[PDB]
Every structure is written in structure tokens, then in C-alpha cells.
Amino acid sequence: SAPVVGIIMGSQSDFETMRHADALLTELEIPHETLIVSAHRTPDRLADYARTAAERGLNVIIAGAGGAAHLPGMCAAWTRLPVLGVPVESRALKGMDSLLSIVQMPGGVPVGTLAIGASGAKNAALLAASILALYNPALAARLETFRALQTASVPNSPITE
Amino acid sequence: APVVGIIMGSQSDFETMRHADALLTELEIPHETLIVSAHRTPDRLADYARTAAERGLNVIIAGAGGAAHLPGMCAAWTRLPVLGVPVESRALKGMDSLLSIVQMPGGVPVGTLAIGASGAKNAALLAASILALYNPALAARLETFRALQTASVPNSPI
Amino acid sequence: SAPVVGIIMGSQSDFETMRHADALLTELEIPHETLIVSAHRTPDRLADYARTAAERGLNVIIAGAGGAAHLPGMCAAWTRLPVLGVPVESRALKGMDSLLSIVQMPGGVPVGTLAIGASGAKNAALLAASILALYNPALAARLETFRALQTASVPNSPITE
Amino acid sequence: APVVGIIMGSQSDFETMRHADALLTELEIPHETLIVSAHRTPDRLADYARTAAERGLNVIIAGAGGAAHLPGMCAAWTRLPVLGVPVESRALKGMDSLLSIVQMPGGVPVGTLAIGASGAKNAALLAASILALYNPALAARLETFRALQTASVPNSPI
Amino acid sequence: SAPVVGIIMGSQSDFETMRHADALLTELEIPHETLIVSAHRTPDRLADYARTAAERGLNVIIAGAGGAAHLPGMCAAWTRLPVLGVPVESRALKGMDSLLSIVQMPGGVPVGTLAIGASGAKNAALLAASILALYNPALAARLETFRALQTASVPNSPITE
Amino acid sequence: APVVGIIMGSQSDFETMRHADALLTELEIPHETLIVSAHRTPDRLADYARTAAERGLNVIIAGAGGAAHLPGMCAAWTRLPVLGVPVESRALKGMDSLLSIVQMPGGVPVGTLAIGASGAKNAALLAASILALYNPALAARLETFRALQTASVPNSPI
Amino acid sequence: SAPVVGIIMGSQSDFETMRHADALLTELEIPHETLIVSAHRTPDRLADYARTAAERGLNVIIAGAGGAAHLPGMCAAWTRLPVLGVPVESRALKGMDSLLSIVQMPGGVPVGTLAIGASGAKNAALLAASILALYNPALAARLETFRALQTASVPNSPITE
Amino acid sequence: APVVGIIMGSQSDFETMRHADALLTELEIPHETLIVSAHRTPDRLADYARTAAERGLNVIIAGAGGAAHLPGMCAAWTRLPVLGVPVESRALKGMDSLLSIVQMPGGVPVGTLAIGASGAKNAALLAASILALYNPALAARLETFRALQTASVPNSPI
Numbered sequence A, C, E, G: 001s002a003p004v005v006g007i008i009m010g011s012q013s014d015f016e017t018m019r020h021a022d023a024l025l026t027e028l029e030i031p032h033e034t035l036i037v038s039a040h041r042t043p044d045r046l047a048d049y050a051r052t053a054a055e056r057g058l059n060v061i062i063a064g065a066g067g068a069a070h071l072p073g074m075c076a077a078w079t080r081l082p083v084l085g086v087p088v089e090s091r092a093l094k095g096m097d098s099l100l101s102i103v104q105m106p107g108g109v110p111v112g113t114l115a116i117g118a119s120g121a122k123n124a125a126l127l128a129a130s131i132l133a134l135y136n137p138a139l140a141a142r143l144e145t146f147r148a149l150q151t152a153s154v155p156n157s158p159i160t161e
Numbered sequence B, D, F, H: 001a002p003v004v005g006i007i008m009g010s011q012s013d014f015e016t017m018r019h020a021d022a023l024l025t026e027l028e029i030p031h032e033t034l035i036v037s038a039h040r041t042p043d044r045l046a047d048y049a050r051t052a053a054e055r056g057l058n059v060i061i062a063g064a065g066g067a068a069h070l071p072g073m074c075a076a077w078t079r080l081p082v083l084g085v086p087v088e089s090r091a092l093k094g095m096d097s098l099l100s101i102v103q104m105p106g107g108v109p110v111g112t113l114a115i116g117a118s119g120a121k122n123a124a125l126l127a128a129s130i131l132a133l134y135n136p137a138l139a140a141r142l143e144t145f146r147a148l149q150t151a152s153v154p155n156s157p158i
């Protein structure tokens, strides 16, 4: 059970957001690694991580960062793997800086970007699951089950109290 | 048979989404390029998304502007990876497009790319990266593309 | 007393906002239904709800959603009834994403959009009431009374304490 | 006799609001199209809004740009449904227009449509949807409009 | 001592902000009235207030409002007096809607706009004082004294604790 | 002798501030129209503001773009009412101009007008409203201006 | 040990942010002064401070301000020294007004601008240190040590609890 | 031998960054002007930044648009002062450029200048101010530049 998804983030504070991606991959039984890699404080670690990801058997990278969020884009610069980016909510600008720093990649090097915050982290895991489900029928079935339960769990009317 | 579907809300969107179409062709990825409007052809959208997987599609690239609902509603109906391209709007220059695509609630993802032509090109490349996981010949072509992209950058401005 | 307005929202969390529309329709004695319909998690429910609304006797739909708020627009895609949209305030972007996702409908499919949050929900009910009052003299009188009391309730000067 | 009033703050606004005028005509909805400035003709505005219902108007469509006060002040004076169209401003591209119209406090509503020509067209359609509740012939024409809009969308970009 | 400045606001909730203008005019000994006038709920009151302001001896109007803030602009539509506008901070959009709704008046009808919130209210009073000081030497002296004390009150270095 | 000073940071600002100049002339208000740069001529600015009152100026209208510091720094040095006009900037379309002028901390006010030509025209009118408090002939001309502005608004778009 | 960096700010409230610059210069053993200078309330103090800075032996000025933040720009107008600007987070607009007021200096008079808030203050000190390290080998060594420790302090994986 | 390096992500960026190049030349500061793409030539970037100090560079000026990562990634690899110029982007007019450069977390600074040509010119001037600390001849030329800039401002608009 070698990892097929890598979850990386710039700092421990990012884990409050990125833990939601970690949890969801575990629930879908997707082998993964969850690591801290700082674009700005460990740039050589980042370069090494990204340029060896494919040969290590990783299939998808989920990268989370806030503020001037460069981790997902610089990861994608160094790997042909799909890289998904999660904008971590920032204090002053509430993730608008995080979002624009990740999604506005110029043509040539993509980052598939999800919503600001916890929703984006969960959706990055689900998008990674969708990608892997293309080749893995068991996982495809688990993902379709997840989506069916999601749909069946929506009540018909709200609770008033 | 197409493995990527490129869909967009209107003819005018094609000025942007043609960059995705061109890139898929350059990488020799079989694809279909179609107009599907979330707001004006919602039943067409529902049928398209619902049947995508059984038709053999692997990735959907969806472009729209303004209150851009096409990628999110497509993802609501398929388990396939859906990639969203915010088309530049007249007034708000794609900021409305961008927020209405990227800010999907948890449970139904859309992988969102940059506003405009860059995003369309990158959606095609991201689709290619996804398909390359399973297809060694395509993976080689994608690596060639990235190598040429890197090698072609000049060292000084003219 | 079959419903003539439908209030729909994507989630239970939306009801904290949309309850203000519910309450106001009740105070104006407008028969209505209040339901959860998720654009993203129950898309078939949404399609069915919208395309049968008119034949069921509904006259106005009030739809609330937050973030990438697609519920009001997709409702309007499937019905000729007037659809009013309430942007629910979002955590990071404070409803700016909700607002733009609802109001910026391209030409052909309208959503009449109200303010972000509780004010917008109350005003959606009042706008629905204004629409229905065009054909219902009793309700027209109740609405004019509401507006008169509103005006008469404004004091001449503020309280200092 | 008009059942919809289209009003706008200035002649230049008509480049936008003419799309509402055209649509009402296409659907054969009797209407009046007028200039009423909140800031420059406030008494004209007060009289217009105050007398709208007794004149037989059912819906008011109001377009304005910048610090756009026309729709809100109109709604302050009438119990009729008032629909607001943010006109694209030079500097802020209608973001000022949009916020000054949509963010009405509770008690006095304005149903707000998109910035620019799309919003003007949609205000007319929303007015038509309102009037169709009571008018079977108009409801049929509106359903025809929506059916043609849906059916006319091509399947592939040229 | 008839009022020479009128402070008006849309609601009691606005007074938390506008009280700072009230207090400052009192400290500068400027006779004033402080009233609630709602653009949207008391439009006839507003029209009457603005169109009689000059003949009543008012010289400056300070108007505060939030959200779709129409009070200052509609006041200025009806009076030749200088009208100063204070954007009241709003819940979702933090006064950005208030600010744009007030400052972006088209050419022909001005509103002199101050900062969002308490700072803007204090500055509206000071700007009104500056206007009145043009014709009132006593007040000019009080205002120059205020500004001198303000300047003299700035310490040379911060306190660390 | 001038009773209003119009100042601006650069020649290019005059494309905007000329509208203030024209309006003051139309209302026959004696004024001076000058270039004063906060960033490039800070000593010129300090002397201008410091001496304004003793020179007989009653109002200063200051226009600037980008990180627009001219109105605020002028108000720092004079007790005269200072009115600020955000000049439209190339990239951010005057949003930077607007925030850097209007968001003055308490203690030193700048009465801020709209971004661009509208704001320049309105700064002149606001200056006129201030001066009309003391000058009956000017008050009459201003009332004539407002009456003509109101009366000139057409009733229907062409 | 005469100061070679001046840290200035408009108010005591700014020190909650600017103290981070003060602390960092002390830790890097860079002699500095930390002062309050208000652009709007002490404009003559500001002019004098900036135009004498170079002759006093200062090499870098770090200036912090919020809202309509004019202190860094007006400082740079009066000195040829490099001036670094720190946008202090504002209440309503969360430092967006601070940021734009500082960074958008027209061509001719630069302000090197750092992030909104505490991060920007720490980085202003580090940027000042980088500038001074060009001529000071001891400080260059201390700065390289700071950066090495920073890098070595990043863990490989997050803590889950 | 260059003491300032001007780098930018692409040829199109040079329309902006040429203003920095021109200014350094005007002040006779030896420099190199190069294309280095964070996203397309990340190894070129790493080598450039890592070796900058030992090559004798004192300041790096880096310009980029969109998700602008070039200045921050450069600062990650060098202890030299790095100055960042947000290049105006097509859709968001450099607001994305600006936020992705200025909002660096604590520990790795980038001194950020205005969006566009103004920022490029100011990055060169800020680099000059830094170098003038150590170089009396350059300090004199910079003071001459600032004196001419101040003295050249006209007193009235034409």
C-alpha cells in the first residue's frame, strides 16, 4: 500500500484545513501521504518532492497554502502529475489572496483549484478520488456509493427551532 | 471515441475554449467540443453529464461566464473529474465567472483553472495529466510538451 | 390553501437566513411551502421541483444559496415562474461569491436578486408579496398596511445612552 | 395602456435599457420608456412612483449607474414590484451600480438583475414572468420565447 | 441658538456611528440637530427635510447610512446646502457597499464623503466645522486650537508592554 | 483673488480636473488651477497648504491617482475644507485612488467625491455650495445651475 | 551604536503590528530607533524626520500605517534612503485600503511594500537586514544563519490531534 | 559586472520591465536583464537565485503577472534583497499579480512596487537607493535624478 496521493502543505497551521482532505482519502480507502513542504522555507525540499513524485508512484498531488500561496504552482512546475490546489483562508484577506495566487496560473502549467478553506480540501480529495476512479473499479464503486449516500441524506424540509 | 468532453455555454465562449480544443488536438487526445448551456439547455446538460461515464468520457472541461453554473451542475450529475474554465465577462472581467465556479461546497468538486485563454489551455493540460496516468504514449507526449515549453523560453527579452 | 410561493434552500444551515422569508410570508397570510432542495446534491429533485412548480399552482419561487450559489439560477432555467434569489452569507467571502453567482445571470433566464443575508430573505418575501398583490386586493391592502406601519414606526430622533 | 414602466437616470443609460424596451415589445407587453433621474429630477421620481399603481402600472424596471439610487427610491414610494438594472459605470464597471441597488435594507425590496445589457433583457423577462401569472395569452408567448431560446442553442461551435 | 448643522441617519443602529459626529459638534460648540430620517422608509420626511433645510437656517447636512446607502445622495438632490456623507459599516460587506453607494454620485449632485465608520463621522463633523469656520472667527480659533492640541498630543515613541 | 484652489499631482490629471476648472468658471468663482505633486514636490505642497488660508483661499480641491496622497497631506496642513477627487488609475481604475483618499483617520478630514470626471465636477459644485453659504449672488447662480440641471432632463430617450 | 534603521508609525495602535519589526532587528543585532510620526497629525515632524534621516546616518526607513496610509509614501518623498512600507490591518477593509495606499506609488518615488499585518512587519525588518547585509559581512552571516535555522525548523509532517 | 538582475517571466512582461532596464541604464548601474520563468523554467530560477550573491549581484528585480510566483521563489533561494513588480494581467488588471507578490508570509520578504510601468520604474529607483548607501558617486546621481524630478514639475496645467 504505497501512497498514490500526496497531500502537502506549507505549515502546521495549514493542517486545520488540509486535515479534511486527509480524512476523506482515508474514508475512501485511498493510500496517501500527508506532509509539510514549504515553498518559501524549504524550496529544495519542494523541488525534490515534486520532481520525484511520479517515479515514486504518486498519481495526484493535493497542495494547500495561504496568502501568497506558491506551493501548488511551484509543485506543478516540477511534475507532470495532476496537481490540485487548496486556498487556505488567510487572516486579513480571507483567502482572496490565497485563491488568486493559486488559480491564476498562466497557460502551460495547470493547478486544478478548489474552494477556499475546508470545503476546498474535502473537494480536492474527492476530485483526486474521481481521477483515480477512472482506472480503479473498486474505488469507482466506493465513490458512487459516497455520492448516492450524500444525495439520499438531504432532507425534504428544514428544521425550525 | 472521445475521452474528453469540452463544453461551453455559448458560441462566444468558444473564443476562449478553442484554446482547450487546440491543445487536446496537439496532444492527439480524442475529444468532442460542444455547446451545452446550463441556463438555456438544462435538460441537455443533465443528459450530457448523466451519460458521460457510460459513453466513455474520462474528463469534462466546462467553460462559462457570468453566473457560471455549467461546470458545477455538470459535476452534480457525474462522478467524472470536471474541470472549470471561467470565461472573461464583459463587466466584471471574469471575477463573477471565477467565484461562481471555484467556490463549490464540499461534496461536489470542480477543478478550476485561470480566467480566460490561459485557463482553457491549462484545463486541456490538466485533462492530459489525468489521462497520462493510464496511457504511457500520452504521458510521453505530455512530457515532450513540457520539455519543449521549458526549453523554448528565451534567456533575454528582445 | 395550497401554496402559492415556494421557499427553497440548499441546506439546513441556509434556513438561519431563509427563515426570515418564511416568517414574513406567514405574517402576510401568504400560503407557502418551505423546502430543502440542493442544486449540487439533489439535482434531479431540483429539476423535478422547478419543472412542476407552475402546474402545481406555485406563483413565485424564493431560492436561497451560498458560495457558488447555483440553486436560484438552475431553478429559473426550468420554470417560467418568477424566481427570486437570496445570497446566503458565506464564511470566507462574506456572501460576495453568493451574490455574484446569483445576480450575474446571462440574458434569457432571470433571477430577481435581493441583498446578502437576512435583509435579502425578508425582502424576497416582500417582493413575492408585491407580485401576488397585483391580483389579490386583500393582500394588496395587507401589504400597504405593512408599509404604512413601517413608515409610522420610524422615530424622529435617536436614543442616546 | 402601459403595464410596465421602464425608467432610467439618463439618455446614456438607454444604450443599456433599450434591451428591456425591445424585449417588452417583442413579447407585446404595453409599456412606457422614460427618463427619470433620482438625483437630478427627485420630484419627478416621487410623483412617478407614487402614482404608478393608480395609473395601472404593474411592474417598474429601473436602470441606473454609479451610486445608483433610482430603483431603491422608486420602491420606497410604490407597493409595485420594482426591478433594478445596474448600468455599467466607466471606472468600476458597474460594481458600484450593483451594490447600490441590490443591498437594500429589509422592508423595501428591489429585485436586482445582472450588470448591463443582460440585466436589462432579464428585467423585461422577469416582468413578463410576473405578468404571465395573470395573463394566459402572455404566458403562452413567454413559454414560446423560452422554448425558442432553448431550441436555438447550437450543438457545436463554428 | 438655532441649529446650523443637521445630522441625519437612517436608523437607531446608525447612531452608534453617527454619535461621534454629534459629540464633536457639541465639543466645538456648534449648534446642531440630530435626527432619524430614513430614505427608504420615510421618503416624504426626507424630501421635506432636505427642501426646507436652507430656509430653516441649516448650513451643512451630515448624513449617515449603510448598505445601499441612499440617504446622503437623495438629501443632496433636494438641497443646495453642502451635504457630507458617512458610510456606516455594514455586516457582510464591511461598508464597501455603503461607501460606493455614497461616494459614486454622478456629476451634478455632490456628496462630500468621509471614511467608513466612526472615523468618517468624526471627520464629517470636523469638515462641517471647517466650512462654518470660514465665516465664524471664534469657531475658526476653536478649530485651530483643536488641531494644535491634536498635533501636540502625539508622543515621540510608542509604549512597549 | 482666488477663493478656490484646484490642485493636482500631474499634467495628465488635468484631463480629469479640467471639469472642476470649467465649472468654477461657469459659476464665476475666482480660482487658481495648479499642479502640486505630493510625492514629487512635497515642499511645494507644504507651503501651498500652510499659506492657503492667509492667502484668502476658502476651499481646496485636490485631485490625484494611484496611492493618492495629495488631498490628505493638504488637509494635514490647513484648516480649510479640502475636497478630494480620485483620478482614474490605469490598472485599478481609481479604486486605489478612492481608498487612499476617502479612508482618512479621524482628526483630518477630506470630503471625497466620485472617481473621475463626475467627481471633479462635483468637487467644484460642492465648493460652490460651501461658498454660497456666505455669498447671496453666488447662491442665486448655484440655484439657477441646479434648476437648469433639473429642468433639462428629457422625459424620453431618443 | 547609532541607529541605522528607523522604524516609524502613525500611532500607538500601529505598534501592535510594528513591534514585530522592532523585535526582529534587535534579534539580528541591528541598531535602530522606533518612533511615532503621524503623516496627518504631525506633518512637520514627518518632513523633518525624513529630510534629515540620511545625514543622521540612517540607512533604511520602515514605515507602518493603516487606512489611507500616507506615512511611507510621504517619507519617501523627502529622503533618498530606501523606504519600506508595512500596511497595518484596518477594521472595516482589513488592510486593503492600507495596502493600496502604500504600494500604488506613482513612478519616481518608491516604497518597497510588504504583506498586510505582522507578517509584513517581520519581513520589513528582514528586507532591511538584507539591504544592510550587502556591506556588513557579520550581519550577512547572522542573516544566513537565521534563514538556515528557519529552513531546518520545518518538520516533515503535520501533527494530528 | 552586473550588480542588479532584472528578471521576468516572459517576453510580454518586458513591455513593463523595460522601464526598470531604462532607469538603471540612465543611472549607469551595471545590470543584466533576463527572462526567468518560475513556472516554465523552475530549475533556471533555482540556479539563478542560488548563485546570485556569489556572482556579485546586490539586488534582484523580478516582474511577473497572474499567479505571480517569480519574486517570492527567487527570495526563497537568496539572501539578497528581492524587489517585486506586479505586471498588469489581462482579466484582473494586476490585482492577482499584486496579491501573489506582496502577501509573502513572514521569513522571506519581497519588497513590492506598484502594478505596471510605475512599479518597474520604482523598483529600479529602489534598487538605486539601496546601492547608493555604499556608492557615493551613485548617491550623487540619484540625488540629481530626484532633484530634476522635483524641479521639472510644472506649476500649471496646459
Ligand SMILES: [Cl-]
Residues within 6 Å of the ligand: B009, B010, B011, B012, D153, D154
Ligand atoms: Cl449561442
Ligand SMILES: [Cl-]
Residues within 6 Å of the ligand: D009, D010, D011, D012, F153, F154
Ligand atoms: Cl440625460
Ligand SMILES: [Cl-]
Residues within 6 Å of the ligand: F009, F010, F011, F012, H153, H154
Ligand atoms: Cl507632470
Ligand SMILES: [Cl-]
Residues within 6 Å of the ligand: B153, B154, H009, H010, H011, H012
Ligand atoms: Cl516568452
